[PDB]
Nucleic acid binder design. Structure first.
Ligand SMILES: [K+]
Ligand SMILES: [K+]
Ligand SMILES: [K+]
Ligand SMILES: [K+]
Ligand SMILES: [K+]
Ligand SMILES: [K+]
Ligand SMILES: [K+]
Ligand SMILES: [K+]
Ligand SMILES: [K+]
Ligand SMILES: [K+]
Ligand SMILES: [K+]
Ligand SMILES: [Mg+2]
Ligand SMILES: [Mg+2]
Ligand SMILES: [Mg+2]
Ligand SMILES: [Mg+2]
Ligand SMILES: [Mg+2]
Ligand SMILES: [Mg+2]
Ligand SMILES: [Mg+2]
Ligand SMILES: [Mg+2]
Ligand SMILES: [Mg+2]
Ligand SMILES: [Mg+2]
Ligand SMILES: [Mg+2]
Ligand SMILES: [Mg+2]
Ligand SMILES: [Mg+2]
Ligand SMILES: [Mg+2]
Ligand SMILES: [Mg+2]
Ligand SMILES: [Mg+2]
Ligand SMILES: [Mg+2]
Ligand SMILES: [Mg+2]
Ligand SMILES: [Mg+2]
Ligand SMILES: [Mg+2]
Ligand SMILES: [Mg+2]
Ligand SMILES: [Mg+2]
Ligand SMILES: [Mg+2]
Ligand SMILES: [Mg+2]
Ligand SMILES: [Mg+2]
Ligand SMILES: [Mg+2]
Ligand SMILES: [Mg+2]
Ligand SMILES: [Mg+2]
Ligand SMILES: [Mg+2]
Ligand SMILES: [Mg+2]
Ligand SMILES: [Mg+2]
Ligand SMILES: [Mg+2]
Ligand SMILES: [Mg+2]
Ligand SMILES: [Mg+2]
Ligand SMILES: [Mg+2]
Ligand SMILES: [Mg+2]
Ligand SMILES: [Mg+2]
Ligand SMILES: [Mg+2]
Ligand SMILES: [Mg+2]
Ligand SMILES: [Mg+2]
Ligand SMILES: [Mg+2]
Ligand SMILES: [Mg+2]
Ligand SMILES: [Mg+2]
Ligand SMILES: [Zn+2]
Lengths: 150, 141, 25, 129, 98
RNA sequence: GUAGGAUAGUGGCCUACCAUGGUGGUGACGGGUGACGGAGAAUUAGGGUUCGAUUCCGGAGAGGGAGCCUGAGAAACGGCUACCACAUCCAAGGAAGGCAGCAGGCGCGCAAAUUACCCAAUCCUGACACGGGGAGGUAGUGACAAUAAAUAACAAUACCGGGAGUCUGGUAAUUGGAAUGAGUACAAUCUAAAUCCCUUAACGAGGAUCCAUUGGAGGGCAAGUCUGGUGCCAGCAGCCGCGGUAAUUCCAGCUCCAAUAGCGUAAUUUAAGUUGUUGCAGUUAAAAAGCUCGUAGUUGGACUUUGUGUUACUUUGAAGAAAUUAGAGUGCUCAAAGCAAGCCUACGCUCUGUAUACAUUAGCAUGGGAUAACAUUAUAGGAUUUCGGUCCUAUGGGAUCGGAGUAAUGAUUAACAGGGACAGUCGGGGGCAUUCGUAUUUCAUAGUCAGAGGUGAAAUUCUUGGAUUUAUGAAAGACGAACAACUGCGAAAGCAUUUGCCAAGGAUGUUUUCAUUAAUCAAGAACGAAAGUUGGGGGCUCGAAGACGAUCAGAUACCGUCCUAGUCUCAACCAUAAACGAUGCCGACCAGGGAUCGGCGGAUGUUGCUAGGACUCCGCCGGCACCUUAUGAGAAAUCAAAGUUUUUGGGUUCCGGGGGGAGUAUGGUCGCAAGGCUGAAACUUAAAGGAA
């Protein structure tokens, strides 16, 4: 189930068996990749780029039209952020809890959740260093974490 | 449950090593406290009869078990040795050399005799069995 | 004897030893 | 987590067989499971099984015929040379006349009788009878 | 030997339940274990309704009722006969009696 | 590390100088061993447990250390020098000492033989065919251990059976003739010489006294409810028990039983699936850490050819001491053994035989490539030809920098794994501030008059100085009723008046994103009811301790009255609970049924309502539970998991091994303390315990 709770939820997306684009989808691969680069330069992340394409352009899966995932397209154009998106959001959450916790010393529930979030940061950072998606000497520092994110 | 991994050889071996100590039979032999027993790991032992004593049989029996306090010659420890058979205490005199043996339960008390774990086998170099059956006689008088 | 009170009796007995041993140090 | 997909597949079949079911679904599928089934199929312990493609791992529906007493994995997968096959059969099989231990050898997945004929050793996957 | 599947109380999926105080002796008892009875009766006993109704100063008046919620500990419920010891089979019957 | 010195020679082996390294939870370092290592030994269905001083191999020592000469070889001890420890002789000035060689003695002990003969065999050594050999062999002692094997056989009578009868079988210190080695002994043989054995003249059995023993006869456990004695004594009894005047159990006789030239008694294997890898347990019997995080460790979804990256694994082979083990051959009379022998009858033969297998792990070498581990991948420093430049170097090669080509140019999928984003929600989840509620207590005002309180009954206690009771109002602190449930939230502890703010979260929804990032976790961390500790605030109520009134034989209690700490709060500690589901976490599978909580999908017609909400019906996912049932499990109680277990193996952590002593002593560590964590032994005991 969940990494840091007893939850056993299974809700998730279910990809269709048809990997090809629908017959009613006329946009070509060069046009799609032009929009993906256009959104990345505006600051959007791979997760929220695909949401816009699905909701406003009828592109259910970018891979079906272009043959590559959104992050791969951004890397080919030098638009992949230095810190991966998912690791970035964990750091932002840890910063928020610490900022809240400095004014609330007796909020022991927050202190408990801060430990879980930071341990989740270190498990993900370890993986990214092994796959060389982070600098080899990159290290998460609570003192300077708030400067990275936000 | 049990650890099953093919690479878990160390944990299984070390786990058993720790758990064997929980076994009373294993711990009695590997503790080293057997050497501190009056026999100090020996099957028999010679000693000097200090006095002839009687011990009240444990309940629900009622009798006076004839024993003898013996000081072991090799280490000077004093023990109580039961004298078996009928009227064999008359064959034992104080300050006499007696061969002692275990009572049969490896240092545990036997029967209704309280706190007695030794018995007398020989007296003055002669077995009590031979004296009891009038095979031999004690060397004196 | 109730286990709780036997536990209480032993703790009292340990305090005296703790005090009867630190008396000479 | 899912550690041995083979154990889930064989455990599902064994439970289904005892309940007297005619079919049973195995998920996920693997080429080890398929080759294990083929060994059972050749000896007439299961009927026809069908692999369903779902673009992720696939699924298998196995037809049962009521001949399978038990089938299970051996974990961990111990090494078994040809000379030690006799000891394993004396442990896992009902008798010296039926029942097969499935091995993975460098020559492929096969039962212990075929392994003796080819004089090849390997590792134990499971057994059935 | 475990006597009841519920352990004598009604608690699932929670750690602690605050206690109440027995209406009879004041003993502390978890609210989910206490025997609760909600008594509703006329504020005037049936032996005095006729006399009070004859002395009424109003042409129409409904005598109010007395609402009292009683929460007993186990010892008081058994002693006061609010509940009785039941046989092993009858212990499982949870429906109120007739 | 560099340079030397020394050594037969490598090397911090040693010196000078320089550097700051080396080892460690994959257990260094230290401690224990009644520890020489191995070949092996015992027991072993398999796996295993225990042992290994001792004849083969290796090492080490010669009373303890050290030093050394001679020599090819020794840090030699049946060589020397010194010290220390023991000890011999002396004319007292000196001198000589090393049995853990053989025998022998003392001592120690439960515990172990002759101060014998010989170089004949085996082999070793010297100048040596010849000498020497306490190595070695021979004999003596020898119930360590092992092998074979006597203590009678037969017939006829008497007696007694079975298949009136008669064949067969059984008993007798009856009666008969036969057999024979134990013993004894001419002899020969044996042997280096003797001795024993083998062979053999004579001799050698009737109660064939040429006398079988050791333990038993209640049960376990084969064998007596026999007779005499004893009377809870004496004694027996491994365990259960026997014995108190009619003892199957003690002491005896008789009889019977077991093994038998043997048998009894006092570490270790088996039994023990009571150490469990194979293969055990942990709801209640002993045993899930209070809870979560977390490193090492251990374990990790699917996918790539079917029809000079590194390893594990598997196959075959090579190498491997003998002895032992297994095993082939062989009639030492058999046997344990031994390694011999066999064939015929010549001046001999079978080249006579003296096989073979096994031998963990590590190492070496072939074949196999499923399973599995590690490593690797997208600015290819890519593969592949071809055309140059430059440099170096032989009788072309190498290195390096470029051009132009060739090609399908080069990225598995998106787990009813996990993480992250997003969406509308949901909750008594947490923190901060804030609102309200009656009650209680106190006080104020007013009214009234004799009791009020409390108990089983009373009394302590309050009260005409106005108690209790009634109305109004104020203050204080606590608490948050009813609603409130086999309901919710939280990792657990725990969480319940309103509203706002702050961060967090599960589930659901999703054709969003990453792509194995995971599971469980030594070490190490966060949180952890109540009580308790330190200080400040507060101090209604209740209330350990204390005091008093009752009750009582007593009452340090239960009941009543008053009350301290405490109860509330802040800062800081403590880390324990029946912290319980007495049930660790992750994953798969395996019956039925209704209800309920959250989210979503579909259908439907009602609302004193503003598509939606409320309700009705169908379904999906997730959660707290309940009900029926066994095809399951279990000692059962009972459990839809405590099921899918002798048809035993999904992954992982913790933890138990009869009852006590004892969560005690001691050491360590944490704490202000209280204590927490870690945690024995001596000794004691035949039951304790679970379910029914
Ligand atoms: K979701
Ligand atoms: K083991
Ligand atoms: K109840
Ligand atoms: K050297
Ligand atoms: K050097
Ligand atoms: K020489
Ligand atoms: K010789
Ligand atoms: K010679
Ligand atoms: K077995
Ligand atoms: K703490
Ligand atoms: K449900
Ligand atoms: Mg799941
Ligand atoms: Mg985890
Ligand atoms: Mg399991
Ligand atoms: Mg009871
Ligand atoms: Mg819950
Ligand atoms: Mg609780
Ligand atoms: Mg040098
Ligand atoms: Mg130096
Ligand atoms: Mg040894
Ligand atoms: Mg030694
Ligand atoms: Mg040895
Ligand atoms: Mg020794
Ligand atoms: Mg010797
Ligand atoms: Mg030797
Ligand atoms: Mg030497
Ligand atoms: Mg000596
Ligand atoms: Mg020397
Ligand atoms: Mg000598
Ligand atoms: Mg010598
Ligand atoms: Mg001896
Ligand atoms: Mg005789
Ligand atoms: Mg008798
Ligand atoms: Mg019998
Ligand atoms: Mg008698
Ligand atoms: Mg007996
Ligand atoms: Mg045991
Ligand atoms: Mg057990
Ligand atoms: Mg208990
Ligand atoms: Mg228990
Ligand atoms: Mg795999
Ligand atoms: Mg997925
Ligand atoms: Mg609710
Ligand atoms: Mg309320
Ligand atoms: Mg720990
Ligand atoms: Mg606390
Ligand atoms: Mg505890
Ligand atoms: Mg517990
Ligand atoms: Mg755990
Ligand atoms: Mg628990
Ligand atoms: Mg619903
Ligand atoms: Mg049921
Ligand atoms: Mg098992
Ligand atoms: Mg125990
Ligand atoms: Zn009550």
């Amino acid at each position: 189930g969940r990494m840091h709770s007893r939850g056993k939820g299974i809700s998730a997306s279910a990809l269709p068996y048809k990997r090809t684009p629908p017959s009613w989808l006329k946009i070509s691969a060069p046009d799609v990749e032009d929009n993906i680069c256009k959104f990345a330069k505006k600051g959007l992340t791979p997760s929220q780029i695909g949401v816009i394409l699905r909701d406003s352009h009828g592109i259910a899966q970018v891979k079906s039209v272009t043959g590559s995932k959104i992050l791969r397209i951004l890397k080919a154009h030098g638009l992949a952020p230095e810190i991966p998106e998912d690791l970035y959001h964990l750091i932002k959450k840890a910063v928020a809890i610490r900022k809240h916790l400095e004014r609330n010393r007796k909020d022991k529930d927050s202190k408990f959740r801060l430990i879980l979030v930071e341990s989740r940061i270190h498990r993900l950072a370890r993986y990214y260093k092994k796959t060389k998606k982070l600098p080899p000497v990159w290290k998460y520092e609570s003192t300077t974490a708030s400067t990275l994110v936000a | 449950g049990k650890t099953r991994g093919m690479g878990a050889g160390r944990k299984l071996k070390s786990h058993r090593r720790r758990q064997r100590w929980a076994d009373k039979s294993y711990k009695k032999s590997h503790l080293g406290n057997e050497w501190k027993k009056p026999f100090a790991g020996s099957s028999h032992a010679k000693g000097i009869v200090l006095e002839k004593i009687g011990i009240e049989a444990k309940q629900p029996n009622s009798a006076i078990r004839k024993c003898a306090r013996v000081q072991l010659i090799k280490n000077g420890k004093k023990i109580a040795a039961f004298v078996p058979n009928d009227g064999c205490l008359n064959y034992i005199e104080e300050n006499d050399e007696v061969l002692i043996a275990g009572f049969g339960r490896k240092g545990h008390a036997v029967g209704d005799i309280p706190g007695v774990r030794f018995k007398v086998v020989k007296v003055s170099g002669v077995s009590l069995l031979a004296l009891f059956k009038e095979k031999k006689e004690k060397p004196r008088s | 004897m109730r286990a709780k009170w036997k536990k209480k009796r032993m703790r009292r007995l340990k305090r005296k030893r703790r005090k009867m041993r630190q008396r000479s140090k | 987590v899912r550690v041995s997909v083979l154990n889930d597949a064989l455990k599902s079949m064994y439970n289904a067989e005892k309940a007297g079911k005619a079919q049973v679904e195995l998920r996920p599928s693997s080429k080890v499971i398929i080759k294990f089934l083929i060994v059972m199929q050749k000896h007439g312990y299961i009927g026809d099984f069908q692999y369903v493609d779902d673009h992720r791992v696939g699924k298998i529906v196995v037809e049962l015929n009521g001949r399978l007493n038990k089938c299970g994995v051996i974990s961990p997968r111990f090494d078994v040379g040809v000379a030690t096959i006799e000891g394993w059969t004396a442990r896992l099989l009902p008798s010296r006349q039926f029942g097969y231990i499935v091995l993975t050898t460098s020559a492929g997945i096969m039962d212990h009788e075929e392994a003796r004929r080819k004089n090849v050793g390997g590792k134990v996957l499971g057994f059935f009878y | 030997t475990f006597k009841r599947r519920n352990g004598g109380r009604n608690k699932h999926g929670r750690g602690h339940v605050k206690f109440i105080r027995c209406s009879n002796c004041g003993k502390c008892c978890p609210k989910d274990k206490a025997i609760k009875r909600f008594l509703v009766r006329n504020i005037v006993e049936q032996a005095a309704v006729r006399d009070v109704q004859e002395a009424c100063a109003f042409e129409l008046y409904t005598l109010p009722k007395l609402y009292l919620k009683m929460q007993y500990c186990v010892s008081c419920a058994i002693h006061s006969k609010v509940v009785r010891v039941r046989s092993r089979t009858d212990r499982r019957v949870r429906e109120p009696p007739q």
